[PDB]
Coordinates of all heavy atoms in Angstrom, one line a residue:
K39 N -35.3 -105.3 26.4 CA -34.1 -104.8 27.0 C -33.1 -104.2 25.9 O -32.9 -104.9 24.9 CB -33.4 -105.8 27.8 CG -33.9 -105.9 29.2 CD -33.6 -104.7 30.1 CE -34.2 -104.8 31.5 NZ -33.5 -105.9 32.3
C40 N -32.6 -103.1 26.2 CA -31.7 -102.4 25.3 C -30.6 -101.7 26.1 O -30.6 -101.7 27.3 CB -32.4 -101.4 24.4 SG -33.3 -100.2 25.2
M41 N -29.6 -101.0 25.3 CA -28.6 -100.2 25.9 C -28.6 -98.8 25.4 O -28.1 -98.5 24.4 CB -27.2 -100.9 25.6 CG -27.0 -102.3 26.0 SD -25.3 -102.7 26.5 CE -25.1 -101.7 27.9
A42 N -29.2 -98.0 26.2 CA -29.4 -96.5 25.9 C -28.2 -95.7 26.4 O -27.6 -96.0 27.4 CB -30.7 -96.0 26.5
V43 N -27.9 -94.7 25.6 CA -26.7 -93.8 25.9 C -27.2 -92.7 26.8 O -28.0 -91.9 26.4 CB -26.1 -93.2 24.6 CG1 -25.0 -92.2 24.9 CG2 -25.7 -94.3 23.6
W44 N -26.7 -92.8 28.0 CA -27.0 -91.7 29.0 C -26.6 -90.3 28.5 O -25.5 -90.1 28.1 CB -26.4 -92.0 30.3 CG -27.0 -91.4 31.6 CD1 -28.2 -90.7 31.6 CD2 -26.5 -91.3 32.9 NE1 -28.4 -90.3 32.9 CE2 -27.4 -90.6 33.7 CE3 -25.2 -91.7 33.4 CZ2 -27.1 -90.3 35.0 CZ3 -25.0 -91.4 34.8 CH2 -26.0 -90.8 35.5
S45 N -27.5 -89.4 28.6 CA -27.3 -88.0 28.1 C -26.4 -87.2 29.1 O -26.0 -86.1 28.7 CB -28.6 -87.3 27.8 OG -28.4 -86.1 27.1
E46 N -26.2 -87.8 30.2 CA -25.4 -87.1 31.2 C -23.9 -87.5 31.2 O -23.0 -86.7 31.2 CB -25.9 -87.3 32.7 CG -27.3 -86.7 32.9 CD -27.3 -85.2 32.6 OE1 -26.9 -84.5 33.6 OE2 -27.8 -84.8 31.6
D47 N -23.6 -88.8 31.2 CA -22.3 -89.3 31.2 C -21.8 -89.6 29.7 O -20.6 -89.4 29.4 CB -22.2 -90.6 32.1 CG -20.8 -90.7 32.7 OD1 -20.5 -90.0 33.6 OD2 -20.0 -91.6 32.2
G48 N -22.8 -90.1 28.9 CA -22.4 -90.4 27.5 C -22.2 -91.9 27.3 O -21.9 -92.3 26.2
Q49 N -22.2 -92.6 28.4 CA -22.0 -94.1 28.3 C -23.3 -94.8 28.1 O -24.4 -94.3 28.4 CB -21.3 -94.6 29.6 CG -20.0 -93.8 30.0 CD -19.0 -93.7 28.8 OE1 -18.3 -94.6 28.6 NE2 -19.0 -92.6 28.1
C50 N -23.2 -96.0 27.6 CA -24.4 -96.8 27.4 C -24.7 -97.8 28.6 O -23.9 -98.7 28.9 CB -24.3 -97.7 26.1 SG -22.7 -98.6 26.0
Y51 N -25.9 -97.6 29.2 CA -26.3 -98.4 30.3 C -27.5 -99.3 29.9 O -28.2 -99.0 28.9 CB -26.6 -97.6 31.5 CG -25.5 -96.8 32.1 CD1 -25.1 -95.5 31.4 CD2 -24.8 -97.1 33.2 CE1 -24.1 -94.7 31.9 CE2 -23.7 -96.3 33.7 CZ -23.4 -95.1 33.0 OH -22.3 -94.4 33.5
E52 N -27.8 -100.3 30.7 CA -28.9 -101.2 30.4 C -30.2 -100.5 30.7 O -30.4 -100.1 31.8 CB -28.8 -102.5 31.2 CG -29.8 -103.6 30.8 CD -29.8 -104.8 31.6 OE1 -28.8 -105.7 31.3 OE2 -30.5 -104.9 32.5
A53 N -31.1 -100.5 29.8 CA -32.4 -99.8 30.0 C -33.5 -100.6 29.3 O -33.3 -101.4 28.3 CB -32.4 -98.4 29.4
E54 N -34.7 -100.6 29.8 CA -35.9 -101.3 29.3 C -36.9 -100.3 28.7 O -37.2 -99.2 29.2 CB -36.6 -102.1 30.4 CG -37.7 -102.9 29.9 CD -38.1 -104.0 30.9 OE1 -38.7 -103.6 31.9 OE2 -37.9 -105.2 30.6
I55 N -37.3 -100.6 27.5 CA -38.3 -99.8 26.7 C -39.6 -99.8 27.3 O -40.3 -100.9 27.4 CB -38.4 -100.3 25.2 CG1 -37.0 -100.2 24.6 CG2 -39.3 -99.3 24.5 CD1 -37.0 -100.9 23.2
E56 N -40.1 -98.7 27.8 CA -41.4 -98.6 28.5 C -42.5 -98.1 27.4 O -43.7 -98.5 27.5 CB -41.4 -97.6 29.6 CG -40.4 -98.0 30.7 CD -40.9 -99.1 31.6 OE1 -41.5 -98.8 32.6 OE2 -40.6 -100.3 31.3
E57 N -42.1 -97.3 26.5 CA -43.0 -96.7 25.5 C -42.2 -96.4 24.2 O -41.0 -96.0 24.3 CB -43.7 -95.5 26.0 CG -44.7 -94.8 25.0 CD -45.8 -95.6 24.7 OE1 -46.8 -95.5 25.5 OE2 -45.8 -96.4 23.7
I58 N -42.8 -96.5 23.0 CA -42.2 -96.3 21.8 C -42.9 -95.3 21.0 O -44.1 -95.5 20.6 CB -41.9 -97.5 20.9 CG1 -41.1 -98.6 21.7 CG2 -41.2 -97.2 19.6 CD1 -41.0 -99.9 20.9
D59 N -42.3 -94.1 20.6 CA -43.0 -93.1 19.8 C -42.3 -93.1 18.4 O -41.3 -92.4 18.2 CB -42.7 -91.7 20.5 CG -43.6 -90.7 19.9 OD1 -43.2 -90.0 18.9 OD2 -44.8 -90.4 20.3
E60 N -43.0 -93.8 17.5 CA -42.5 -93.9 16.1 C -42.6 -92.6 15.4 O -42.1 -92.5 14.3 CB -43.2 -95.1 15.4 CG -44.7 -94.9 15.4 CD -45.4 -96.1 14.7 OE1 -45.5 -96.1 13.5 OE2 -45.8 -97.0 15.5
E61 N -43.4 -91.7 15.9 CA -43.6 -90.4 15.2 C -42.3 -89.6 15.2 O -42.0 -88.9 14.2 CB -44.7 -89.7 16.0 CG -45.1 -88.3 15.4 CD -45.6 -88.4 14.0 OE1 -46.6 -89.1 13.8 OE2 -45.1 -87.6 13.1
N62 N -41.6 -89.6 16.3 CA -40.3 -88.9 16.4 C -39.2 -89.8 16.3 O -38.0 -89.4 16.2 CB -40.3 -88.1 17.8 CG -41.3 -87.0 17.8 OD1 -41.0 -85.8 17.3 ND2 -42.4 -87.2 18.4
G63 N -39.4 -91.1 16.4 CA -38.4 -92.1 16.3 C -37.6 -92.3 17.6 O -36.4 -92.7 17.6
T64 N -38.3 -92.0 18.7 CA -37.8 -92.0 20.0 C -38.5 -93.1 20.8 O -39.5 -93.6 20.5 CB -37.8 -90.6 20.7 OG1 -39.2 -90.2 20.8 CG2 -37.0 -89.6 20.0
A65 N -37.9 -93.3 22.0 CA -38.4 -94.4 22.9 C -38.1 -94.1 24.4 O -36.9 -93.8 24.7 CB -37.9 -95.7 22.5
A66 N -39.1 -94.0 25.2 CA -39.0 -93.8 26.6 C -38.4 -95.0 27.3 O -39.1 -96.0 27.5 CB -40.3 -93.4 27.3
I67 N -37.1 -95.0 27.7 CA -36.5 -96.1 28.4 C -36.2 -95.9 29.8 O -36.0 -94.7 30.3 CB -35.2 -96.5 27.7 CG1 -34.3 -95.3 27.4 CG2 -35.5 -97.3 26.4 CD1 -33.3 -95.0 28.5
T68 N -36.2 -96.9 30.6 CA -35.9 -96.9 32.0 C -34.8 -97.7 32.4 O -34.8 -99.0 32.3 CB -37.1 -97.3 32.9 OG1 -38.2 -96.4 32.6 CG2 -36.8 -97.2 34.4
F69 N -33.6 -97.1 32.8 CA -32.4 -97.9 33.2 C -32.7 -98.8 34.3 O -33.1 -98.3 35.4 CB -31.3 -96.9 33.4 CG -30.9 -96.1 32.3 CD1 -31.4 -94.8 32.1 CD2 -29.9 -96.5 31.4 CE1 -31.0 -94.0 31.0 CE2 -29.5 -95.7 30.3 CZ -30.1 -94.5 30.1
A70 N -32.4 -100.1 34.1 CA -32.6 -101.1 35.2 C -31.6 -100.9 36.3 O -30.4 -100.8 36.1 CB -32.5 -102.5 34.6
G71 N -32.1 -101.0 37.5 CA -31.2 -100.8 38.7 C -31.1 -99.4 39.2 O -31.0 -99.2 40.4

């Protein structure tokens, strides 16, 4: 569980990491709820 910054509002909501791409340093997260 982590707190990702929503690209739409700009606020940090609770999200869970589903996949991690270390190649680009990014991670596909899914906001809980």
Side-chain angles (χ1 to χ4, degrees):
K39 275 294 180 63
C40 58
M41 300 210 69
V43 179
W44 201 12
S45 194
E46 294 301 283
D47 211 77
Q49 308 307 277
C50 50
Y51 300 77
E52 189 185 279
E54 183 163 72
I55 304 169
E56 303 282 270
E57 178 71 88
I58 303 178
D59 192 273
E60 57 183 277
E61 180 65 51
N62 291 274
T64 57
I67 47 92
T68 300
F69 297 92

